[PDB]
């Protein structure tokens, strides 16, 4: 009389131990592959006062290529994969499967735009821990890559109809989450550290900072953006400033596929039937989430 049944499970891309594990992992990978020449980081005591700590170490820079990594399940546990269409990322999944390792991932540290990630199968999907809460980041997953090619010439090229269509479809999904009679407008970052204010990322081991104003100024040919490579920067693994070694060659190239974005919606009790969105990012954890949102490690029982 016993009946057969598919084992469903509840996922929460926003509370995933795999994300935190990867964050510490990417960090370890870096500290043993791209150390700074000088690292200045805060050093505080309970009282509340702080003195600056300076660390000088060998900072050998070697040409770096993308090493694909994935996460596998240790003896005793299993990794569930949600396979539902346009999965929200939170709640119970129906068509679930099991895998030995996650898909192949090419980690990339960045802000505003997500690079060389996994695309959406169906159409564009936007996900947030809570859309009503404007203080929560919205992770946009594109279903179609937009190539952006850089050059030490100080500017990265990007299609204009490609990226204009991208904003046009993203805006549509935002209306499906906030309202169809609402007006969507994209605005640049409201400010902060340069890394936050610009589309910054690390390519080949260099830190690029590109102006993204032309990318986030829209009302519902090539688009060249001014990029600059810095040697002194604010660290992403922790609060502090660091100075990395100067570029080896000269004219540092970079080819990447924009697969997603990190956006925030301006909070406003302002009843105006219009919602504004700016480029977000900063916590590389959301970056790790956009890739691990459909995974959940569970105990074999």
């Amino acid at each position, epitope marked *: 009389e016993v009946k057969l049944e598919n084992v469903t499970e509840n996922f929460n891309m926003w509370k995933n131990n795999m994300v935190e594990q990867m964050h510490e992992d990417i960090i370890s990978l870096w500290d043993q592959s791209l150390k700074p*020449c*000088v690292k200045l980081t805060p050093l505080c005591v309970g009282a509340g006062s702080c003195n600056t700590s300076v660390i*000088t170490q*060998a900072c050998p820079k070697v040409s770096f290529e993308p090493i694909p990594i994935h996460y596998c399940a240790p003896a005793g546990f299993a990794i569930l994969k949600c396979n539902d269409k346009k999965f929200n990322g939170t709640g119970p999944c129906t068509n679930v499967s099991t895998v030995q390792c996650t898909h192949g991932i090419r980690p990339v540290v960045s802000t505003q735009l997500l690079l060389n990630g996994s695309l959406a199968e169906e159409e564009i999907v936007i996900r947030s821990e809570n859309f009503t809460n404007n203080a929560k980041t919205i992770i946009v997953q594109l279903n179609e890559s937009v190539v952006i090619n850089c050059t030490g010439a100080g500017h990265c090229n990007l299609s204009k109809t490609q990226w204009e269509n991208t904003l046009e479809q993203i805006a549509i999904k935002l209306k499906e989450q906030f309202g169809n009679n609402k007006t969507i407008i994209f605005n640049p970052s409201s400010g902060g550290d340069p890394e936050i204010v610009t589309h910054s990322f690390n390519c080949g081991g260099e830190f690029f900072y590109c102006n993204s104003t032309q990318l986030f100024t829209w009302n519902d040919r090539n688009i060249t953006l001014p990029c600059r490579i810095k*040697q*002194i920067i604010n660290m992403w693994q922790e609060v502090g400033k660091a*100075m990395y*070694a*100067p570029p080896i060659r000269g004219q540092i190239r970079c080819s990447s596929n924009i697969t997603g974005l990190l956006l925030t919606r301006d909070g406003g009790k302002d009843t105006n039937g219009t919602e504004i969105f700016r480029p977000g990012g900063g916590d590389m954890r959301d970056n790790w989430r956009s890739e691990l949102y459909k995974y959940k490690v569970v105990k074999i029982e």
Partner: antibody
Amino acid sequence: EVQLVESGAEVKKPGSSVKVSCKASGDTFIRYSFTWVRQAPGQGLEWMGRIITILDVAHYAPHLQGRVTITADKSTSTVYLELRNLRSDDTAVYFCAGVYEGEADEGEYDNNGFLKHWGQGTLVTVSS
Amino acid sequence: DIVMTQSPATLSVSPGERATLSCRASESVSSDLAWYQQKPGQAPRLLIYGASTRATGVPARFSGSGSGAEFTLTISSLQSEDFAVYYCQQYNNWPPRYTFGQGTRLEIKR
């Protein structure tokens, strides 16, 4: 393309300390790193330390076990070199020097260790 | 740490003739090698840096070459202003611990 000028000569008693100044003018202070080189009478050049002014971080030569400190004041474009518990054999001409690092205020830094601009040098005699 | 040796200690060449100074690193330094000229009572002057690039305002008769742990400064026509002491300095190691050579004085041969 700067101009470096140091303070006058000094006579010091053993066990005291001296602080030589170097006024840099002619260009953006925070875009140059400054080094201090000493030379006892009849000897060669001795590297003492260099300071990355934009980061306000200084590095020194090992055998100067905390008796030396290199500082900078962006407010006056002036580098300083303090030396403590002086010994008669600390008598030498101390030179101040610097080189261009690039657009530091924009994040770029060559971190060049050579010396292009020099001060006139300052004689520091240590004796009883 | 990195010991820089210059040779000869003293070199006697005739005015208008060619001179060549040697500098050796106790280990590799790549091309972070600079050359300085110092006349008595005066401060040092930077001639070469990058091992082979000549600073601005420095006569074309002055030229550097070398790499690794072996470098050489060359003057192709000694002038009176050219008879002084020359030092080589490495600055490729990090944490920084830059070091100068002990010098090579150039004297007029008569």
